[PDB]
Amino acid sequence: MQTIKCVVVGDGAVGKTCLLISYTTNKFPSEYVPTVFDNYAVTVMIGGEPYTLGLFDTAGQEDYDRLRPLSYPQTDVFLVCFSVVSPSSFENVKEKWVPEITHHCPKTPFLLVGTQIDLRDDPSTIEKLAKNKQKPITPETAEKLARDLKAVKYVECSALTQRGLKNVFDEAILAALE
Amino acid sequence: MQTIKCVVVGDGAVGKTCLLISYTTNKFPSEYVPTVFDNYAVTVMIGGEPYTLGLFDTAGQEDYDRLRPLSYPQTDVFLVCFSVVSPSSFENVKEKWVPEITHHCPKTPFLLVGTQIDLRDDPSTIEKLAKNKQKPITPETAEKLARDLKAVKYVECSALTQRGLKNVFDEAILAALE
Amino acid sequence: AAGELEERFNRALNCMNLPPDKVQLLSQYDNEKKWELICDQERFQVKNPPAAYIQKLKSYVDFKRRVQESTQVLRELETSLRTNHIGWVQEFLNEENRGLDVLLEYLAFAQCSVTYDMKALRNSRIVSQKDDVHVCIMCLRAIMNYQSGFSLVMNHPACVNEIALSLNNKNPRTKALVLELLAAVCLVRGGHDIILAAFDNFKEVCGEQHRFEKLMEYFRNEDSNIDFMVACMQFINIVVHSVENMNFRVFLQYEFTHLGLDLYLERLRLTESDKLQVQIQAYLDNIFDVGALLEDTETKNAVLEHMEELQEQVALLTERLRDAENES
Amino acid sequence: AAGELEERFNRALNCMNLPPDKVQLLSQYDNEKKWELICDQERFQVKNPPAAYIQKLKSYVDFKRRVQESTQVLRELETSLRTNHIGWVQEFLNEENRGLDVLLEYLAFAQCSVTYDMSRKALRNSRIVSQKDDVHVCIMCLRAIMNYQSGFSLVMNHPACVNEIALSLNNKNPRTKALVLELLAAVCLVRGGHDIILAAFDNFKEVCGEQHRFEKLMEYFRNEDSNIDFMVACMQFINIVVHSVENMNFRVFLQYEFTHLGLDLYLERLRLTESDKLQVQIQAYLDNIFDVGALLEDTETKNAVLEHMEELQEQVALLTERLRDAENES
Ligand SMILES: Nc1nc2c(ncn2[C@@H]2O[C@H](COP(=O)(O)OP(=O)(O)NP(=O)(O)O)[C@@H](O)[C@H]2O)c(=O)[nH]1
Ligand SMILES: Nc1nc2c(ncn2[C@@H]2O[C@H](COP(=O)(O)OP(=O)(O)NP(=O)(O)O)[C@@H](O)[C@H]2O)c(=O)[nH]1
Ligand SMILES: [Mg+2]
Ligand SMILES: [Mg+2]
């Protein structure tokens, strides 16, 4: 048989772990825990052939910068994640994450993934973000980035609303086989 | 009638007035009076002829610098004074006094006169001077000086113990007639 | 599947530069999920040795681009310092390679195009592209993540003075990182004296009148980027009040007042940025006013003599009330 | 000896530039020794007009050594400035003669070899005149001009004037240095005069190529123990420059400015001398020194004795409540 290794990288508290849990069990968790490393396994069907989908969850905080690349070996597709309402998390894509994975796992396709689309209309974030004179990333700005970073495609989703959530992993799997 | 005018200049509290009062009278004053200007007259006989000796006492304080030179016109001989126990008084002979008398009355002879010889050996004057890293003026150094400034002669004197006092004024009458 | 695996785990753990905080938060794993870590560690390999980068970087120092891949080679050089095992860093910075040196040599090469705006120049103006030059600071920030390397940064003379020179770069993101960096070195023990010597150097080489005055221009006149102002304001607040001696504090405080800090901050207290308003108010609570402090000192002694006036008034009064009570 | 009302006496009393202090003592003289003065003034005449001195000095500004007799010209000018009627000074300083200027440019000329070892055609011609007394005599002339009320005002409004004097501290003679410091000390205490002295040392910083303000002041003061009277005027200048200030945040700025230059640890060694003027000047400075730490410790916290004073404030009230009730029991 065959297996598809998928690693989710991204800034701390972007919602990597909820992204992985609101997908597999459709339960959106309440608890915030800084995730150290975790492994999930799900069998998925493509063209009547059983694939075992490997989901790897990594740490976002800078303390595990030395530990994180242990999840990297044998990766078929990467997920580079940021939140649409935190520009800090956005530009660490060009500064940290994309350069990190292209060092350790070159010639590995990856998707650009925006999370927390549901807060793009949230009132309390409207003022909080504008107060520091910045605004959330429009779909226009991110897909111009993915086009520069030689990313495969750009997808966005919310783990809470599950809107376009399944869509993320499926477009990701398609890139995994190339 | 002929007369010999003699003007006494020198720093304040050098003992000019005591020099003139312990000469004309034999009473030595202790009382300190800052003299603005004063006039004395004593008849002295030269070669058996009565000459009237004019003694002019001038101010030492720098406040009367513009007042003092009124006593200068028609001066026959000057007495330029410093104290042997005050080097401060010593160097004002060259920077202040001698160039002052030679501006207003050039080609007029003058004597270099050191006063207060009795304190050259006094302990409290030795110590007070030695504490400020100084030493009383040697007789060698005073005539070291006199030749350079074109003085007539160097004579030294103490008004307290009248001593070598008559000699000064004789040498002054002496320079006056040539 | 070793039956006594504890020793291995520790050996391949401290070679990950983990804080005492995060290293036993981890020490309590299942025995199986501990072996799992030990075996990925040795299964992981380093693609390129530190000497490889030294060469390709040292050679960049001498028309068209052998500096073409400079931006990315430096960029994956940063990545290697940060994410490879700490052993890799020890080797890069050691004496045979002398990595910190050659690294510093290149930054100086790229930044003599930016320090001369406000020898043979040749290739420096093109290399002055903001991406080539700024990653270099990130390489240093990474070295300063490692304890031995951070002390190695402080006892290297030109290093810290060099970082301060990179404050001249026109990019707000770069400026802020420099200020963030200098802030850390400033508060570590004796590190305050090191920062001063760096800005003193900055005064002479830039040809300016007062010491940190090119900085004051940057802080005041740009209202575009907020987080720069945050890192900037925080650097200033540290340099003035982090000091031990309180005479030195008011001396340094006055020097900034002269640069028109207080008169600009009166207008900048108006911003509705939460992040800047908090850093500004923090500086404003810390200011000294020697005038006010002498006035309340007189007051103390004078109330001492009024407390002596109260101690004396109560004595006489109560003594006379008992003399009236006895005459009754 | 005509007896009018004697305010022909007033004219020569003014025109002698005497302090009001001394005019109180002098105006109450006898009548004869009062008119006797008036006619000595009218008999006294001035040898040379200021233009005579101006010309021969301006000519010195452009082998050479034809100036050799310069030193005496300066010495005879000083004598003229100090001891002549006050008008002679005004005539020297007015727009026509323009004395301060030509005087100042000559000082600058004699002093460009000593400010440099640390315009060249002269630079060579500067070293020989610098040996001479000329540099030190010139300063004595300014000392004379600044005791004159109107002239002292003309000096501070002159930009370069005081600024050249600050450079006059570099001359090799200890007595000369001391004169510069007493002078600059004096200009320092007049209203608004403080900033002019600092700006002079600011100029002094660059022209001498020195790191910090002063610091050259500090060296002459520090490394020379030869002359007693220099340090006295020196130490009191420092005492002035630091504690005379309006703002006390600026004062402690200045105290540190000198402290950093190693004043305080040197003064502990210099406190051993019992030269009286120095023992007084050092201790005078140490009594004025500030310690924000000390002011902060006794403003520690709470000021809780306020409510210990309130316990006292409540006590007098209550005691008085019993004494007025005693007037009622009476
Ligand atoms: N509104 C909203 N909140 C979200 C979303 N996704 C995650 N969160 C929340 O954001 C917080 C962090 O999410 P989490 O999944 O733990 O983040 P992470 O990237 O795994 N962080 P780490 O790297 O530290 O493990 C959590 O409280 C979670 O509820 C989202 O789509 N919308
Ligand atoms: N030991 C000693 N003291 C003297 C001698 N002559 C004067 N004095 C003292 O020195 C002090 C000043 O003397 P005085 O005659 O007033 O000086 P002056 O030169 O007239 N000063 P002024 O110019 O201010 O009037 C006086 O206290 C006086 O007693 C001397 O020969 N020996
Ligand atoms: Mg996680
Ligand atoms: Mg007298």
Residue numbers in the entry:
A (entry chain D), B (entry chain B): 1 to 178
C (entry chain C): 31 to 92, 110 to 165, 213 to 422
D (entry chain A): 31 to 92, 110 to 165, 211 to 422
Sentences from the paper on this structure:
The mammalian formin-like proteins constitute one family of DRFs, which include the large, multidomain proteins FMNL1, FMNL2 and FMNL3 (also known as FRL1 or formin-related gene in leucocytes, FRL3/FHOD2 and FRL2/FHOD3, respectively). The activity of some formins is regulated by an N- to C-terminal intramolecular interaction that renders the protein inactive, giving rise to the classification as Diaphanous-related formins (DRFs). In DRFs, the N-terminal regulatory domains comprise a GTPase-binding domain (GBD) followed by an FH3 domain that interacts with the C-terminal Diaphanous-autoregulatory domain (DAD). Here we uncover the structural basis of the specificity of FMNL1 and FMNL2 binding towards Cdc42, its membrane association, as well as the dimerization properties of the formin.
We succeeded in crystallizing the complex of Cdc42GppNHp with FMNL1NCC (1–458, Δ172–198), the last canonical armadillo repeat of which ends at position 380. The complex was refined to 3.8 Å resolution, allowing information on the overall assembly of the four subunits and the formation of the coiled coil backbone. The interaction network including the specific interactions of the insert helix seen for the FMNL2–Cdc42 complex are similarly observed in the FMNL1–Cdc42 structure, which is reflected by an root mean square deviation value of 0.63 Å over the aligned amino acids. Surprisingly, the FMNL1 FH3 structure is directly continuing into a parallel coiled coil segment starting at position 384, which could be resolved up to position 422. The mostly hydrophobic dimer interface of the FH3 domain is essentially formed by two phenylalanines and one tyrosine as seen in the electron density map. These residues are located on the first helix α17 of the fifth armadillo repeat and supported by neighbouring residues. The typical knobs-into-holes packing of the coiled coil assembly starts with its first amino acid V384 and is continued in the classical abcdefg hepta-repeat scheme, with residues at position a and d forming key interactions of the coiled coil. Binding of Cdc42 to the FMNL1 dimer leads to formation of a convex surface that contains the membrane interaction motifs. FMNL1 assembles into a symmetrical homodimer by its coiled coil domain following directly the armadillo repeats of the FH3 domain.
